[PDB]
Amino acid sequence: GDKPRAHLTVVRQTPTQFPALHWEHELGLAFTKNRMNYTNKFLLIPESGDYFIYSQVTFRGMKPDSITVVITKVTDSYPEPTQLLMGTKSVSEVGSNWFQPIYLGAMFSLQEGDKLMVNVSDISLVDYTKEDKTFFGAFLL
Protein backbone atom coordinates (compact mmCIF):
# COMPACT_ATOMS: atom_id res chain seq x y z
CA GLY A 1 0.00 0.00 0.00
CA ASP A 2 2.25 2.79 1.31
CA LYS A 3 5.30 2.09 -0.86
CA PRO A 4 7.45 5.10 -1.91
CA ARG A 5 6.31 6.14 -5.42
CA ALA A 6 6.89 9.09 -7.77
CA HIS A 7 6.10 9.96 -11.37
CA LEU A 8 7.83 13.17 -12.48
CA THR A 9 7.16 15.12 -15.67
CA VAL A 10 9.23 17.44 -17.84
CA VAL A 11 9.33 21.25 -17.57
CA ARG A 12 11.20 23.90 -19.55
CA GLN A 13 14.77 23.62 -18.32
CA THR A 14 16.36 26.65 -16.64
CA PRO A 15 19.77 27.33 -18.23
CA THR A 16 22.96 26.04 -16.59
CA GLN A 17 29.12 17.08 -17.87
CA PHE A 18 25.87 15.49 -18.92
CA PRO A 19 23.65 18.04 -17.26
CA ALA A 20 20.83 16.82 -14.98
CA LEU A 21 17.19 17.48 -15.79
CA HIS A 22 14.78 19.06 -13.32
CA TRP A 23 11.15 18.03 -13.11
CA GLU A 24 7.54 18.73 -12.25
CA HIS A 25 6.59 16.70 -9.17
CA GLU A 26 3.06 17.79 -8.26
CA LEU A 27 1.09 19.39 -11.12
CA GLY A 28 -0.91 17.45 -13.73
CA LEU A 29 0.10 13.78 -13.80
CA ALA A 30 3.23 14.27 -11.65
CA PHE A 31 3.28 13.14 -7.98
CA THR A 32 5.39 12.03 -5.04
CA LYS A 33 4.02 9.95 -2.16
CA ASN A 34 4.80 7.64 0.70
CA ARG A 35 8.02 9.42 1.71
CA MET A 36 9.45 9.76 -1.82
CA ASN A 37 11.03 13.24 -1.81
CA TYR A 38 11.80 15.20 -4.98
CA THR A 39 14.47 17.65 -3.84
CA ASN A 40 17.25 19.63 -5.58
CA LYS A 41 16.74 17.75 -8.88
CA PHE A 42 17.03 14.37 -7.11
CA LEU A 43 14.53 11.75 -6.27
CA LEU A 44 15.51 10.90 -2.69
CA ILE A 45 14.98 7.25 -1.71
CA PRO A 46 13.35 6.92 1.79
CA GLU A 47 13.56 3.16 2.27
CA SER A 48 16.08 0.50 1.30
CA GLY A 49 14.59 -1.98 -1.13
CA ASP A 50 14.25 -2.99 -4.76
CA TYR A 51 12.78 -0.24 -6.97
CA PHE A 52 11.63 -0.20 -10.57
CA ILE A 53 13.01 2.99 -12.13
CA TYR A 54 12.11 4.49 -15.52
CA SER A 55 12.42 7.50 -17.81
CA GLN A 56 11.59 8.64 -21.29
CA VAL A 57 13.22 11.65 -22.83
CA THR A 58 11.85 12.81 -26.15
CA PHE A 59 14.59 14.57 -28.09
CA ARG A 60 13.88 16.86 -31.03
CA GLY A 61 16.20 18.69 -33.43
CA MET A 62 17.02 22.40 -33.43
CA LYS A 63 24.64 19.08 -35.40
CA PRO A 64 24.48 16.30 -32.76
CA ASP A 65 26.08 12.95 -33.69
CA SER A 66 24.07 11.16 -30.97
CA ILE A 67 21.60 11.65 -28.11
CA THR A 68 21.93 9.99 -24.65
CA VAL A 69 19.80 9.56 -21.52
CA VAL A 70 21.49 8.20 -18.39
CA ILE A 71 19.80 7.50 -15.09
CA THR A 72 22.32 7.88 -12.27
CA LYS A 73 22.46 7.00 -8.55
CA VAL A 74 24.41 9.10 -6.04
CA THR A 75 25.10 7.36 -2.71
CA ASP A 76 26.31 9.13 0.46
CA SER A 77 29.25 6.78 1.07
CA TYR A 78 30.48 6.72 -2.54
CA PRO A 79 32.27 9.70 -4.13
CA GLU A 80 31.38 8.59 -7.66
CA PRO A 81 27.86 8.41 -9.12
CA THR A 82 26.76 5.04 -10.52
CA GLN A 83 25.18 4.83 -13.98
CA LEU A 84 22.20 2.49 -13.65
CA LEU A 85 20.66 2.78 -17.13
CA MET A 86 21.82 4.29 -20.39
CA GLY A 87 19.96 4.80 -23.67
CA THR A 88 22.14 6.19 -26.41
CA LYS A 89 21.26 6.52 -30.06
CA SER A 90 23.25 7.82 -33.06
CA VAL A 91 21.31 10.48 -34.97
CA SER A 92 21.08 9.80 -38.68
CA GLU A 93 19.13 12.52 -40.47
CA VAL A 94 20.66 15.96 -41.08
CA GLY A 95 18.87 19.26 -40.45
CA SER A 96 16.41 18.86 -38.93
CA ASN A 97 13.08 18.82 -37.21
CA TRP A 98 13.62 15.18 -36.36
CA PHE A 99 12.23 13.90 -33.09
CA GLN A 100 12.51 10.71 -31.12
CA PRO A 101 12.09 9.19 -27.62
CA ILE A 102 14.55 7.15 -25.64
CA TYR A 103 12.79 5.00 -23.02
CA LEU A 104 14.62 3.05 -20.25
CA GLY A 105 13.35 1.16 -17.17
CA ALA A 106 14.74 -1.53 -14.88
CA MET A 107 14.87 -2.82 -11.30
CA PHE A 108 17.71 -1.84 -8.89
CA SER A 109 18.47 -2.47 -5.21
CA LEU A 110 18.66 0.94 -3.57
CA GLN A 111 19.64 2.14 -0.05
CA GLU A 112 17.73 4.68 2.01
CA GLY A 113 19.37 8.04 1.30
CA ASP A 114 20.27 7.22 -2.32
CA LYS A 115 19.48 9.98 -4.84
CA LEU A 116 18.38 9.35 -8.44
CA MET A 117 18.76 11.78 -11.33
CA VAL A 118 18.37 11.79 -15.10
CA ASN A 119 21.23 13.24 -17.18
CA VAL A 120 21.10 14.10 -20.92
CA SER A 121 23.77 14.71 -23.57
CA ASP A 122 22.15 17.99 -24.70
CA ILE A 123 19.56 19.87 -22.65
CA SER A 124 18.60 22.03 -25.63
CA LEU A 125 17.38 18.97 -27.56
CA VAL A 126 14.96 17.83 -24.85
CA ASP A 127 11.29 18.22 -25.74
CA TYR A 128 9.79 19.92 -22.67
CA THR A 129 6.42 20.82 -24.21
CA LYS A 130 4.18 18.08 -22.76
CA GLU A 131 4.09 16.03 -19.54
CA ASP A 132 3.38 12.84 -21.54
CA LYS A 133 6.52 12.97 -23.68
CA THR A 134 9.39 13.28 -21.18
CA PHE A 135 9.09 11.81 -17.66
CA PHE A 136 10.97 10.02 -14.89
CA GLY A 137 9.53 7.69 -12.21
CA ALA A 138 10.35 5.13 -9.50
CA PHE A 139 8.44 2.77 -7.23
CA LEU A 140 9.35 0.38 -4.44
CA LEU A 141 8.35 -3.11 -5.66
Site of interaction with a second copy (CB under 8 A): 3, 5, 7, 29, 31, 50, 52, 54, 56, 58, 66, 70, 82-90, 92-93, 96-109, 130, 132-133, 135, 137, 139, 141
DSSP-derived secondary structure for 90-137: E--S-SS--EEEEEEEEEEEE-TT-EEEEEES-GGGB--S-TTTSEEE
Shortest Cβ distance from residue 90 to a second copy (Å)?
5
Shortest Cβ distance from residue 75 to a second copy (Å)?
13
Pick between residue 16 and residue 25 the one whose CB is nearest to a second copy.
25
Pick between residue 16 and residue 103 the one whose CB is nearest to a second copy.
103
Shortest Cβ distance from residue 108 to a second copy (Å)?
6
**Helix, strand or coil, per DSSP, at residue 141:** coil
Pick between residue 61 and residue 113 the one whose CB is nearest to a second copy.
61
Distance CA 86, CA 114 (A): 18
Of all helices (H) and strands (E), which one includes residue 8? strand 5-10
Shortest Cβ distance from residue 22 to a second copy (Å)?
18
Q: Which residues contact 9 (CB under 8 A, 6 or more apart)?
A: 23, 24, 27, 28, 29, 30, 131, 132, 134, 135
Pick between residue 39 and residue 105 the one whose CB is nearest to a second copy.
105
